[PDB]
Amino acid sequence: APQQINDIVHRTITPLIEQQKIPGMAVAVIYQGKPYYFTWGYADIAKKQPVTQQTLFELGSVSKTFTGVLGGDAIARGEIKLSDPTTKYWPELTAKQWNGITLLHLATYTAGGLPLQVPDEVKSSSDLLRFYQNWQPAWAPGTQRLYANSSIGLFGALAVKPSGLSFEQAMQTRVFQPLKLNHTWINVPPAEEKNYAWGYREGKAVHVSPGALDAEAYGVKSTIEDMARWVQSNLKPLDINEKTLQQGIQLAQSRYWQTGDMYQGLGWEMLDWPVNPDSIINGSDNKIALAARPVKAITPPTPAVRASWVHKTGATGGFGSYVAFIPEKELGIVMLANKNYPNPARVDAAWQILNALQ
Ligand SMILES: CC(=O)c1ccc(N2C[C@@H](C(=O)O)CC2=O)cc1
């Protein structure tokens, strides 16, 4: 690797691992479109398995970027429209409060205060219908952003309905396969078990628990190589041969809403580059609090802006992940760890690395 990359990565990540007591970590830096890999520590402490380029990590909420792109692909295929009422694709959602709530609102956490989690008690499709029927919005649709797995989760489930495919089937055939993400999974197959890192929470080895709409929201597991490829695809969508997928990526990076300096995409989130990193490290967009923020509609959405800091953070009980890239500069980073640690620390490291290389 170029020595500048080697040096900035090792000098930034090594103390991060110390400070945060992270058992294992993988990092990819995309520089001038080409990936460079770095690993530390252990995928499995008890069995002394090292982190490698083939180690599978739980992406947690970084999964939403895949959901956003799959949804974008569905729009490009003419199967759904983001302007469509939720009830067009779920006719049994007859409750009044659903009047005026569109697929756009679900995809961007702006439906009017859908809760963070689908309750663990929801097990059947009937249970799921009752949950959404009984939910009472705090705000009119398209006025406030409140991060919610129940929001984008429902978007994901509904987006695939016209295809007749299950969410998994659609993600595999329309996103993973075409992009050659052959070590990226919604359900980790037995063949890949040996590569699946354990997450660590309070010293215990843990994997993510199953839940309703888990696949759509926080269900993807992937290697550092595959995540690098994902970043490459998002940095330069025009190099992708499948036309609906290329368009899907572009739609996911469009700017639909603004809060402060932040713009909400489909899964992806964006800030204008050059970035003042204060808001994403210390301020209103540092992701520590669950925050209800008034949004200003971008009418219509600005197409993918090349000079953007495009990013998503993610966690599960036992994992922490971060992805950021700057299309203009052909530059990106992926950070995967098998311990959940604070988002501001993750963003601080990513900024330090990318700012040095930009
Ligand atoms: C305290 C808490 O449960 C909590 C849950 C989710 C979040 N959010 C809100 C999201 C965001 O604001 O970007 C991301 C994220 O993890 C923040 C706090």
Swiss-Prot record:
Swiss-Prot/TrEMBL catalytic activity: a beta-lactam + H2O = a substituted beta-amino acid
Regulation: Inhibited by the beta-lactamase-blocking agents avibactam, enmetazobactam, relebactam, nacubactam, vaborbactam, taniborbactam, zidebactam, and beta-lactam-analog boronic acids, via a covalent binding to Ser-61. Inhibited by non-beta-lactam, benzo(b)thiophene-2-boronic acid (BZBTH2B) and various cyclic boronates. Not inhibited by clavulanic acid. Inhibited by O-aryloxycarbonyl hydroxamates, via cross-linking of the active site Ser-61 to Lys-312. Weakly inhibited by citric acid.
The protein, known as: Beta-lactamase
UniProt subunit comment: Monomer.
Compartment(s) of residence: Periplasm
PANTHER family the UniProt entry points to: BETA-LACTAMASE-RELATED (PTHR46825:SF8), D-ALANYL-D-ALANINE-CARBOXYPEPTIDASE/ENDOPEPTIDASE AMPH (PTHR46825)
Designated gene of the protein: ampC
Classification via Gene3D superfamilies: DD-peptidase/beta-lactamase superfamily (3.40.710.10)
Pfam family of the protein (one): Beta-lactamase
Conditions for induction: Can be induced by beta-lactams. Expression is not up-regulated by the non-beta-lactam inhibitor, benzo(b)thiophene-2-boronic acid (BZBTH2B).
Residues bound to a beta-lactam: S61, Q117, Y147, N149, A315, N340
Organism: Escherichia coli (strain K12)
Cellular component terms per the entry's GO annotation: outer membrane-bounded periplasmic space
Enzyme class name: hydrolase
Function (record text): Class C beta-lactamase which confers resistance to penicillins and cephalosporins. Has benzylpenicillin- and cephaloridine-hydrolyzing activity. Has weak cefuroxime, cefotaxime, cefoxitin and oxacillin-hydrolyzing activities.
Note: The class C beta-lactamase family has a specific amino-acid numbering system known as SANC, for structural alignment-based numbering of class C beta-lactamases, or else the simpler name structural position. A multiple sequence alignment was used to derive a consensus sequence and then the consensus was numbered taking into account insertions and deletions. This allows use of identical numbers, e.g. for active site residues, despite differences in protein length.
InterPro entries per the UniProt record, alphabetical: Bact_CellWall_Synth/Modif (IPR050491), Beta-lactam-related (IPR001466), Beta-lactam/transpept-like (IPR012338), Beta-lactam_class-C_AS (IPR001586)
